[PDB]
Amino acid sequence: IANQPVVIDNGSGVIKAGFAGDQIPKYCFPNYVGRPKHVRVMAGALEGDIFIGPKAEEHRGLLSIRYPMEHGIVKDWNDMERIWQYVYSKDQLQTFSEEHPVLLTEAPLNPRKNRERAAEVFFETFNVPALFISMQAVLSLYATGRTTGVVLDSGDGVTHAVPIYEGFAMPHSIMRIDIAGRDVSRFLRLYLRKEGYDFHSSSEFEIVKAIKERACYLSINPQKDETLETEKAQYYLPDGSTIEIGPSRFRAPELLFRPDLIGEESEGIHEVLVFAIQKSDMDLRRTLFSNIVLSGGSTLFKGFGDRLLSEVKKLAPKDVKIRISAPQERLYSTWIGGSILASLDTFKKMWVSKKEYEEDGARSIHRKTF
Amino acid sequence: EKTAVVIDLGEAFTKCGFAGETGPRCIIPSVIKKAGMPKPIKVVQYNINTEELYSYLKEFIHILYFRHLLVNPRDRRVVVIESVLCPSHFRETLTRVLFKYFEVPSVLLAPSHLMALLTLGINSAMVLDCGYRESLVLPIYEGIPVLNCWGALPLGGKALHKELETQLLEQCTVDTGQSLPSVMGSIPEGVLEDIKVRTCFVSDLTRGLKIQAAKFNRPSPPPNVDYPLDGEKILHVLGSIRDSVVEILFEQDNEEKSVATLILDSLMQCPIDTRKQLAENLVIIGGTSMLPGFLHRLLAEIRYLVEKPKYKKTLGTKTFRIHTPPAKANCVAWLGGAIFGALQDILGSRSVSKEYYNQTGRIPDWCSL
Amino acid sequence: AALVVDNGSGMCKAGFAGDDAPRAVFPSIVGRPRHQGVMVGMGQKDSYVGDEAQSKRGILTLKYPIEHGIVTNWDDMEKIWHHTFYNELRVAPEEHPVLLTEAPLNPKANREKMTQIMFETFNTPAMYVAIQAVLSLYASGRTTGIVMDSGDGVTHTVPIYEGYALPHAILRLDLAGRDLTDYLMKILTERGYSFTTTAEREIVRDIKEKLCYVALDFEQEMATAASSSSLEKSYELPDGQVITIGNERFRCPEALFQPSFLGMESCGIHETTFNSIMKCDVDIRKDLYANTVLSGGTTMYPGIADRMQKEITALAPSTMKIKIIAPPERKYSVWIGGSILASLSTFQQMWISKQEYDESGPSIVHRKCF
Ligand SMILES: Nc1ncnc2c1ncn2[C@@H]1O[C@H](COP(=O)(O)OP(=O)(O)OP(=O)(O)O)[C@@H](O)[C@H]1O
Ligand SMILES: Nc1ncnc2c1ncn2[C@@H]1O[C@H](COP(=O)(O)OP(=O)(O)O)[C@@H](O)[C@H]1O
Ligand SMILES: Nc1ncnc2c1ncn2[C@@H]1O[C@H](COP(=O)(O)OP(=O)(O)O)[C@@H](O)[C@H]1O
């Protein structure tokens, strides 16, 4: 439709949205499916479970929250539908799918089935007449203005390091890791359990995620500071309970680069990036070292970029000038680029109309997708 | 040669005996009967002064070897049957009592499921420990205890005791000296535990459905015997009461949180090999599991939960053959410690040397260095 | 009498001189667990050789020193060899001379490293290394022929005209079935069959050997297979998962016919072989048309000879008749070719003894190559 397109700052752990012309996604909130902690068979319980925002931010020791998109894999389709309806409501969208164009953003390693199922809901339940599915790295590049670059993202579990020069669709250059702060905080609370602090409920763990986003960092001398005797600064919960953190405040996030004791011997995206470097060529590599972009929310850490700088410095050889662009709104960079893409006229032709979806569907998705 | 000191531990108890000892020499709880103090002060304490604990350790360990051993352990090693999640600093306080205070030769820390694997003499295993206050599932990949796949939840008998006191608030027909609903303030949970030992029978799965009917829209309260306490305190408890406390172990409405949920999902993170492996490589430990009519009703519900929508596809058709403990499931862990300390003197190298703790003052745990 | 040791790029094969069945039929793959905070499981190995790694494949990190045949850490394969002796034949390498395999365009340092392991380490009385394609044509019983050799790690067509050196047309090509398996698990990931480790790769390479065949008209067969829902055959895996493969079976080997799928900047296998053909005398290439020696165990495919044949036939003149030489035992004909090759009179003199090596150093590898 010829209206203001819905610019969505999508995501497995944090999904926000706004519109074109807006400089910020008008309603910032994360990805979560908030169900009660009790049997809602008896009347007078937390039924409906459509608890997004203040409803979820209301009941704490009463909500067992769920998460649909797990590393780009969404299974709580109907829960996504009610979250959509929450957005479609006058608290977030104030309009309808038919009333406004919608823009969908994605990342690699996304099976076609997720795209098809989501498009089914978006063109059948909701009916966007002007809907397009896209990436997120493109939008981050739009925000940075660059087109040439080793774009990285640090989502909740979304981590793709694909070197993309001048917007070149290079699928063989795909280097996507599907893990981030999510499981990091999960075993960080396992450390808390190692020192007697159980957080089994979702909200009980959501507070831990608030610590992850609040009191967690990257000690650039991980084994040195680990060997150094910690001091364990005390954290204070919404309950105000005194909780020391210390080594664990940087252990589990430094463990991303050094997955030594995980079992899932991951890489720490710098290794994956070196693999992507190998995929590229020295003439382009030399340029792309300076062309490195970061995104997502897990990038937010004290000593984050500098630790990874030290990592690649230990990795890259001499006379290798590397530059890693990373603003402060890596999350919004996607949304900013979504507004930029919304401002594109080619994008108008890039989107699939509702009728076009009715004509082909999945084939139209994966053919007109790019 | 020498019989290493095999010491069982845990939230509730602390047992011990020689290396290869076949038999419960004694059973000590995880508390210390403090002199002057009318109640036995516990040891399972967190975010607490490790110095008063150090005193408890010195005295308690001293008289402890005098209880189970009646002789100084400075000649042989000490098998320390630990388990993960305990404060490693507290564990080092234990270590300093050992080396820095009693000067024991050398010790070694090992989890319970490891000794369970020693008992079965197998390599891969999907074992759950029915701890006192908690639940503890631990998968093994051919002798390798799986890290990312596990089970650990505050799902033990302590919460059930809280539920029992709630029932005491509800069901209380304590005669005069004739109802007296919880007129008496505190309850001795240890006495309540032995009451459960002599009373808590466990029903059927269909009776579990009867308990579900008792929740909304009552069947078969017998077998049920009243309880007379000394001092004219006699009260009756239905069998449906204790069975309700057993059945509430699987409340998954809107939260999907239970025992089988933990087990199933722990297997969900396992790979293809480990799936069928742990299906056949299956055992269950913990004392709390030893309930009359609970393991088979339990197992039946486990097999029932295999029919949960996300599990027929994924797991589904897998033979869940379970190993059995040759003795009491609780003592079987201590028995596995006895198994290790019995014929493995060669593994003193793996045992934490006193020398290292002397020249170090610490022990780096499973972290760097 | 001697030691006919084959070094398969995937699995392995071995035996004495003149042995008929390969004894060391085991995976020539290296594996180690996640050496972490846990203790040993009743005492066990560190490295896991083949079947041992294949056994406990859920944790043992399936690796390779082999880089399309290029062994990086020779320690791995040499310990594997020691155990291979003391596994299959339990014979020391010092009493029987050894026979090894090789592929053209191999850095000589590899073979010299190998050589010094056999002498300095294994103390073999004599030794020899030759190309697998020679054993293939040896098993055929010819001397004139284009031996299209195809290992599951590499590929190299070998044009020969009466056992003569024609290396200008002989071209190594790092074409592995593992590469196809890479792309295969990738396309499976978008098919909902999202799997990551190498254990998954082992299962699906066996599935590749199960149902992945070679069609005849890839696009037409692709459209019909898209319509042939029954062709999308299923198989309930060792785990509770089942599969669905109709296109995938032949969709995956088209990467060999089309480097475009991987962006190999090469030519398809059929015309690649034809390019190697184009580097010769066309009138002796006539014999090579008749000498269509399809070899290498990675050619055991359904509908592959007619495919390849038809392709090059379209490239060839009408009079230039393709005459396929491809026994299904070509996989074993490598090791069996070496096994019966050991029984050659001249070969019992053609050797590299202890003092012959020591007194010549690694330089003797050059003239003692073939
Ligand atoms: N039935 C089958 N269907 C499809 N492919 C098969 C089948 N049987 C064998 N293969 C192919 O054979 C390959 C392994 O054979 P091959 O002899 O090339 O192993 P190798 O380790 O490379 O031996 P070498 O290095 O000595 O050549 C596999 O990659 C597989 O693709
Ligand atoms: N300060 C922080 N420290 C660690 N992780 C963070 C921080 N801020 C955000 N994150 C993580 O990044 C995620 C947000 O990034 P985003 O790209 O929106 O993730 P997704 O795309 O998975 O929703 C959050 O879900 C959280 O896991
Ligand atoms: N025969 C039994 N029946 C029921 N519960 C038991 C039995 N034996 C022990 N238990 C309980 O099971 C738990 C296991 O004992 P223990 O090893 O001391 O547990 P933990 O390691 O949590 O302390 C204890 O709470 C104990 O009270």
From Swiss-Prot, chain A:
> Where found, per UniProt?
Cytoplasm, Cytoskeleton; Cytoplasm, Cytoskeleton, Microtubule organizing center, Centrosome; Cytoplasm, Cell cortex
In terms of superkingdom, the source organism counts as: Eukaryota
What UniProt keywords are attached to this protein's entry? Acetylation, ATP-binding, Cytoplasm, Cytoskeleton, Nucleotide-binding
Per its record, what are the GO molecular function terms?
ATP binding
Provide the primary localization: cytoplasm
* SUPFAM superfamilies (alphabetical): Actin-like ATPase domain
Q: What is one cellular component GO term in this UniProt entry?
A: dynactin complex
Q: Disulfide connectivity?
A: none
SMART domains, alphabetized: ACTIN (SM00268)
Which CDD domains has this protein been placed in?
A: ASKHA_NBD_Arp1
- UniProt xrefs under PROSITE patterns: ACTINS_ACT_LIKE (PS01132)
Describe its partners and assembly state: Part of the ACTR1A/ACTB filament around which the dynactin complex is built. The filament contains 8 copies of ACTR1A and 1 ACTB. Interacts with dynein and adapters such as BICD2. Interacts with BCCIP (isoform 2/alpha).
- Function, as annotated: Part of the ACTR1A/ACTB filament around which the dynactin complex is built. The dynactin multiprotein complex activates the molecular motor dynein for ultra-processive transport along microtubules.
The record's similarity note reads: Belongs to the actin family. ARP1 subfamily.
Give the protein's recorded name: Alpha-centractin
Organism expressing this protein natively: Sus scrofa (Pig)
- Gene of this entry: ACTR1A
UniProtKB/Swiss-Prot annotation, chain B:
Gene3D superfamilies to which the protein is assigned, alphabetical: 3.30.420.40, Actin, Chain A, domain 4
User: Where can this protein be found?
Assistant: Cytoplasm, Cytoskeleton
- SUPFAM superfamilies, A to Z: Actin-like ATPase domain (SSF53067)
- One Pfam family this chain carries? Actin
Q: Could you list this entry's UniProt keywords, alphabetically sorted.
A: Cytoplasm, Cytoskeleton
What InterPro entries does this protein map onto?
Actin, ATPase_NBD
Q: Which CDD domains is this protein grouped with?
A: ASKHA_NBD_Arp10
A GO term from the CC aspect:
dynactin complex
A single GO BP annotation from the record? Answer: retrograde axonal transport of mitochondrion
Q: Which domain of life is it from?
A: Eukaryota
According to the record's subunit comment, the protein's assembly and interactions are: Subunit of dynactin, a multiprotein complex part of a tripartite complex with dynein and a adapter, such as BICDL1, BICD2 or HOOK3. The dynactin complex is built around ACTR1A/ACTB filament and consists of an actin-related filament composed of a shoulder domain, a pointed end and a barbed end. Its length is defined by its flexible shoulder domain. The soulder is composed of 2 DCTN1 subunits, 4 DCTN2 and 2 DCTN3. The 4 DCNT2 (via N-terminus) bind the ACTR1A filament and act as molecular rulers to determine the length. The pointed end is important for binding dynein-dynactin cargo adapters.
Q: Which family does it belong to?
A: Belongs to the actin family.
Role according to the record = Part of the dynactin complex that activates the molecular motor dynein for ultra-processive transport along microtubules.
Q: What is this protein called?
A: Actin-related protein 10
- What does the record give as the organism's lineage? Eukaryota, Metazoa, Chordata, Craniata, Vertebrata
From Swiss-Prot, chain C:
PTM comment for this protein?
A: ISGylated.
Instruction: Look up the EC number in the record and give it.
Output: 3.6.4.-
Q: Name one GO biological process term.
A: regulation of synaptic vesicle endocytosis
What are the protein's GO molecular function terms?
A: ATP binding; ATP hydrolysis activity; identical protein binding; kinesin binding; nitric-oxide synthase binding; nitric-oxide synthase regulator activity; protein kinase binding; structural constituent of postsynaptic actin cytoskeleton
UniProt KW keywords: Acetylation, ATP-binding, Cytoplasm, Cytoskeleton, Hydrolase, Methylation, Nucleotide-binding, Nucleus, Oxidation, Ubl conjugation
Localization per Swiss-Prot or TrEMBL? Cytoplasm, Cytoskeleton; Nucleus
Q: What is its main location?
A: cytoplasm
Catalytic activity reported: ATP + H2O = ADP + phosphate + H(+)
Database matches in Pfam families: Actin
Query: Which residues carry the post-translational modification N6-methyllysine, per the record?
Result: K79
Taxonomically, which superkingdom?
Eukaryota
Transmembrane segment boundaries = none
Entries under InterPro entries matching the protein: Actin, Actin/actin-like_CS, Actin_CS, ATPase_NBD
Task: Tell me where in this chain the PTM Tele-methylhistidine is found.
Answer: H68
Methionine (R)-sulfoxide modifications at: M39, M42
What GO cellular-component annotations does this UniProt entry give? actin cytoskeleton; actin filament; adherens junction; apical junction complex; axon; brush border; calyx of Held; cortical cytoskeleton
Instruction: Say what the protein does.
Output: Actin is a highly conserved protein that polymerizes to produce filaments that form cross-linked networks in the cytoplasm of cells. Actin exists in both monomeric (G-actin) and polymeric (F-actin) forms, both forms playing key functions, such as cell motility and contraction. In addition to their role in the cytoplasmic cytoskeleton, G- and F-actin also localize in the nucleus, and regulate gene transcription and motility and repair of damaged DNA.
- Please state which protein family the record places this protein in: Belongs to the actin family.
The entry's other comment says: In vertebrates 3 main groups of actin isoforms, alpha, beta and gamma have been identified. The alpha actins are found in muscle tissues and are a major constituent of the contractile apparatus. The beta and gamma actins coexist in most cell types as components of the cytoskeleton and as mediators of internal cell motility.
Name this polypeptide is given? Actin, cytoplasmic 1
Species for this entry: Sus scrofa
Q: What gene makes this protein?
A: ACTB
